[PDB]
């Protein structure tokens, strides 16, 4: 129940930080 | 795979299949990733008994037709005569001429409705299947166990592959070996 919800919220949080890091690079790349 | 694990041939077979840019005959390796969509009802070491079990689909039927091999025989055959003129009232008085000729000498033709609608609704989602039975992997959970037969299953049957039946009480029968 609750331990599985806490692990998945750990996973999804560290997931969309990485896809946040991708858009940081591309918007920096498209300026050049 | 079936039980949460992943296949070692289906991974290796597809990743060298990605290398079809550099070599076309590496594309034969995708045949390793061809896993069957079938269940197998082998109860003893040798006997596969001919068992009947059914479905639980929500509103219909599907899968495996591949029927259509018509060449679409088409015809130009006509261009519609669009002369819109005195033609319009001339065909109308011709239809008046048929109201003396048709309904007064002989026209008694009739046809019947709703015969073709009748066979559709009592349909079978209860399709019975012998031992090496194919099933789409989306319907590993909406199948039905053979409880209506004498020979009823024992292994938890919820995903395709191979199982044992509990061949129940005595007079064991129904071989098939082609």
């Amino acid at each position: 129940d609750l331990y599985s919800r806490y692990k998945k919220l750990q996973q999804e949080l560290e997931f969309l930080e990485v896809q946040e890091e991708y858009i940081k690079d591309e918007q920096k790349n498209l300026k050049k | 795979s079936r039980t949460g694990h992943t296949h070692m041939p289906s991974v290796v077979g597809v990743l060298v299949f990605t290398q079809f840019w550099f070599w076309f005959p590496l594309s034969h390796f995708l045949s390793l990733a061809y896993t069957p969509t079938c269940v197998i009802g082998l109860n003893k070491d040798l006997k596969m008994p001919k068992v009947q079990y059914k479905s639980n689909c929500k509103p219909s039927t599907f899968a495996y037709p591949a029927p259509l091999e018509v060449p679409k025989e088409k015809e130009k055959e006509k261009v519609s005569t669009a002369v819109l003129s005195i033609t319009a009232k001339a065909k109308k008085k011709e239809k008046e001429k048929e109201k003396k000729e048709e309904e007064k000498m002989e026209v008694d033709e009739a046809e019947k409705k709703e015969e073709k609608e009748k066979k559709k609704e009592p349909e079978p989602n209860f399709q019975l299947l012998d031992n090496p039975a194919r099933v789409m992997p989306a319907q590993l959970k909406v199948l039905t166990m053979p409880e209506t037969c004498r020979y009823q299953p024992f292994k938890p049957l919820s995903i395709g592959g191979i199982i044992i039946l509990k061949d129940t009480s005595e007079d064991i029968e129904e071989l098939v070996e082609p």
Binding site: - | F20, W21, F22, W23, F24, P25
Partner: protein, 287 residues
């Protein structure tokens, strides 16, 4: 045993000898030789390029001097490296690249001598901006003349590097030779020593470009930016429901909104920051 999708390796010095010798004799179709190595069946590499003296005939087999051939090779065996010739080149200034009439005659002599002897055609005057018009070609036989030439097979690197251009396929190309793929042997121990040594300035990073040239520039830009702000006021206080996405397209003027906006403000920001950071560091460092 027949052709596939090959690959041509050129050294960094080889391309530089091509464009320099082409820029030297820009009107009169310069000619030279190409010296490399056959490493396998179907990838060719070249390490070296030396040119030819100018012949009055033109680009043909008569422009090849055999005594300048062997005695130049005589020197390169004992100094540097001895290797086999693998081809040749010339320059065609009037167009991009296609083998002409007297081009294709001297090719038949070379493929009778060597296995392939790949031709190279370079326009020196077309290559201006940041790209080079270089392409290498290779003649086909007449045995498959009613069959499909370029017998290529199991690969997928053929659709790149050029499609056949219409200024090149109107001539030979297709049913006479084939086009081949060329990439560059990019190396380290050369790449950074060309980069850092060609574009470099040490003390420029903390110069001042003064104040008397700089306060005048800060004086100027603010003045039209004031009127740019007045034009920015005019659209904001307008704000009418004349279908404002259609009201904006009927009021196109290459103007205000946001394009003629902060673009100037960014230049005003960057100019004064680099001016003041250079001013504050120079007070810090020196005494």
């Amino acid at each position: 045993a027949v052709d596939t999708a090959e690959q041509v390796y050129i050294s960094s010095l080889a391309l530089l000898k091509m464009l320099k010798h082409g820029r030297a004799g820009v009107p009169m179709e310069v000619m030279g030789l190409m010296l490399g190595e056959f490493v396998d069946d179907y990838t060719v590499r070249v390490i070296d390029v030396f040119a030819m003296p100018q012949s009055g005939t033109g680009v043909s087999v008569e422009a090849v001097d055999p005594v300048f051939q062997a005695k130049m090779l005589d020197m390169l065996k004992q100094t540097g490296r001895p290797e086999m010739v693998v081809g040749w080149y010339h320059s065609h200034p009037g167009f991009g690249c296609w083998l002409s009439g007297v081009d294709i005659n001297t090719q038949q002599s070379f493929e009778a001598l060597s296995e392939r002897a790949v031709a190279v055609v370079v326009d020196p005057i077309q290559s201006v901006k940041g790209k080079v018009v270089i392409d290498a070609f290779r003649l086909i036989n007449a045995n498959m003349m009613v069959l499909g030439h370029e017998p290529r097979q199991t690969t997928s690197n053929l659709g790149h590097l050029n499609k056949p251009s219409i200024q090149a396929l109107i001539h030979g190309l297709n049913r006479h030779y084939y086009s081949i793929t060329i990439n560059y042997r990019k190396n380290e121990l050369e790449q950074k020593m060309l980069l850092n040594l060609h574009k470099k300035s040490w003390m420029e990073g903390l110069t001042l470009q003064d104040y008397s040239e700089h306060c005048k520039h800060n004086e100027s830009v603010v003045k039209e930016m004031l009127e740019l702000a007045k034009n920015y006021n005019k659209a904001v206080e307008e704000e009418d429901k004349m279908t404002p996405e259609q009201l904006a397209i009927k009021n196109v003027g290459k103007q205000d909104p946001k394009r003629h906006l902060e673009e100037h403000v960014d230049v005003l920001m960057t100019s004064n920051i680099v001016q003041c950071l250079a001013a504050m560091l120079d007070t810090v460092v020196f005494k």
